[PDB]
Amino acid sequence: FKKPTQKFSGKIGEVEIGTGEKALKLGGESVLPFYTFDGDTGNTPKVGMEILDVYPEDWIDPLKDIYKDVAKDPVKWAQFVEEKYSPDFICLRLISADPNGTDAAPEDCAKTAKAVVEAIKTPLVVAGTGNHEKDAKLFEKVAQETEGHNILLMSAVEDNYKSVGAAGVMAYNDKVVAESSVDINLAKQINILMNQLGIDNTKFVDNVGCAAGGYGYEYVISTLDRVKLAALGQDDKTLQVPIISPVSFEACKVKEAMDSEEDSPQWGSQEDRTVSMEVATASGVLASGTDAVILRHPKSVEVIRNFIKELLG
Amino acid sequence: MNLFQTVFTGSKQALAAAEGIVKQAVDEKGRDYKVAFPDTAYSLPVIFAATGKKITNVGELEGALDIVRSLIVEEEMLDKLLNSGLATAVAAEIIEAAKYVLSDAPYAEPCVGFISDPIIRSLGVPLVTGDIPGVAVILGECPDSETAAKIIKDYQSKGLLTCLVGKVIDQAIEGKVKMGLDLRVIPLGYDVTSVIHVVTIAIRAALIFGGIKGGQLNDILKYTAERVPAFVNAFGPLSELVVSAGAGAIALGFPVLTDQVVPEVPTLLLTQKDYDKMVKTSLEARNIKIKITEIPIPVSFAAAFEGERIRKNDMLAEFGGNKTKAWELVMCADQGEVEDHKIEVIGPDIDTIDKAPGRMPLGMLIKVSGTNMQKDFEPVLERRLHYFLNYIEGVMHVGQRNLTWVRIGKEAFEKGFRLKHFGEVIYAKMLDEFGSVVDKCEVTIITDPGKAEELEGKYAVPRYKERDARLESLVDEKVDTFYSCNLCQSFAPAHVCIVTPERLGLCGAVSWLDAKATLELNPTGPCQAVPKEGVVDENLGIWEKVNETVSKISQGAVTSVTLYSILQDPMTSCGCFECITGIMPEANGVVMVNREFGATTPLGMTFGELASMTGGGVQTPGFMGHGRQFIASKKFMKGEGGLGRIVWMPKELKDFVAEKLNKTAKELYNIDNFADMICDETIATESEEVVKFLEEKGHPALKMDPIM
């Protein structure tokens, strides 16, 4: 029999997030994920930890027990996460800027992000809310305040891609995430718009969408497969950027993880179900072609890091 | 003194002033004294842009005079004139740099002098997003303070960033113009050389946002010409130095407007004496468009208001339908024929109604003017009218062309709705949605019985007839490009639709003109042009360019396709197709089935099984998914003898298609009623019975060569 020699003409580009000795690089691979028997895998996929700019009230009880004395102050929370768990990066989610919730001015969130980014050495990812109009102004003020640290700004959708691209990559030398909703064509369109704006493939990453296991997950898997095959096999230049997936954003929000043992006695431990959901979603997206995953529970980060080390090592 | 000599003279004067002030800096501070601008990383931006060199000491500032000298070549050709304009810009920068060397703070408020890099990054984001529509560089002096204040505040009210040089700074102060960075009214300085401080803004915009390294002068000039929407308004008498500095603005792609008599250059140097039109002249000259924030209508306008049904007894007004004559039309017109934002209501308005219902003719004539506007784009925009009107609560409009009727309830009348608001909404939405193809829009609402019918006959019906004629007369050979749509790749990863004049998109909602309009309006959308070059087989419809485009779009899943055949590398199908065509070998022909048909077919499979086998973006020879307009096409199965092979078809589909099918088969030289030779489900459904019917009726398909 002949060994399967799958030669790809394409190659994923590298994007650097952060400054100093903690800065990480994403992308650089020329084969399918964990296909060390086919060629070169550029950089190991990264695992980041999610923190909030306000106290997490909807999080499960074990998570609030882990961060009991640090979740009140985002700076203290970030320092605790960097010290005790030492992740690849920290994703600071500005929940307080949500128009649906306790809407806050962009200045307050920018100040919180500036305080956080000057206390940690690991790369920081600043994630906004689901509102495009709010996101544009928020990221303007956040990128203005957090200048000189090479942060990553999430959710630069087509509605506000110009604003986040200008306030981000162009003005204050940051990186950005071009987000598209589970479509290869939409990912191509947003990448082409970013390139025509003046931002090359070395200055942004892609978010082809994320979903928890069992909730539109096959669409995420198929989108990741199609994007990876087009970028590598077909040498499509508009898709040769690393992909980042926020897993904890949707994985921890589902009923299979949020419900406590009191609500569903047969299901069992709530923390175990949350960790299992995070691990399953992260493993699937990592196998399908993502380059960085955002997780919430520290045990999930440990399990996913061990999984990556076992597969690559 | 002609234009070239005026510019050369000005550049020499700029060089003379630069040499004199540099000599003062050398004598007072020495060649080792530091040269810098407050808070910038680009040293002197113009010199850094042109040469890539950073100037740090006075001795290098003196050596920068050679750059000015090398840029002044007194030969009357356009390139030398632009280089001489750049010589003035470099000389002005050297003068401004020496000002900071000689005096610690050379600018006193209100003048700001040099603009630091953090300010550029602060206003750079609005420049990219269009929140700042443009940069108005106003220099000189207006005939009076109020004229300057009016023009400046006109630019300010439109969101433009205006910079001031010269006596207009004092005139604006006398005119009480509120100056500030947040107020977007920046006075640079009273000297002409202070105009370099807004020039470096455009230069550093290329350096910061364009990512262009220093010394790439052509790339920087290209960037400022395409990306920086700056223009110059030069008021008052213009010296040679002012003209040479304007040549520098022209060198950066910024048009220069003035109220003085000058040797005008089209699109670059323009004279506009009318101060009441200078703002509009500049916006047109710089291609600047100001977007409308909200629709000026008392009635609320939202997309959720579509589909509202409003009571009959509340119908204040009702136009169109079987009661009255109503029509709508969107027509391309030359710039002279349509004036921007002109809503004309002719005839009685809805106020005159004093009875519970209303009954009067309504005619909406919409004229759109633009550089890229085409007649083929008219049918698209007109369709959006249906939507533009339905988003207004209180009014419901449905119909096509002259078949439209509009019902207006009395709640909108109580709120203050009139017929002019129709024009306001139409103009605002035409400039929003089609702002890339429409420059000016004029809406006329006609209610008089006479003018409504006169304008319909003069304008409406000829447009409809020519549109129908173009739709019917377009063939593949006449056009030179096809189009490719991949909108169904969301569920069919390998499907690429090739739209030609005689092959409609199999979803049935995309045509060749629709694809062209979609490509024009949404260049990064799903519809992309496919040049029809490199033909291989004209009868089977094989093009090398088409194969290459299909291979690229489908991510290599599909290699070769044939447009006019179903047995040799057929086109793929996704799943939106209305009809399925399948090969019947025993009849030496083809049968068809629509999605509304539930019974079995002579092939032995229902519509569901055929859809499962055919769709999904897979090349299946012998089966095709297509729309209802493709059956009576001359390109239908052109690679297998044409549409004469159709032997079985559902009764309702046959009744729907019969007229056009008989026309095309008459082109084939068949009988007047060719559809009678086509078997129905009622006549016969079993294959043997179908073949018996075909033999009895003398179907042409039985007498052709074998299909496969």
Ligand code: SF4
């Ligand atoms: S079926 Fe219609 S929408 Fe789908 S790809 Fe073809 S032309 Fe586009």
Ligand code: NI
């Ligand atoms: Ni389709």
Ligand code: NI
């Ligand atoms: Ni389809």
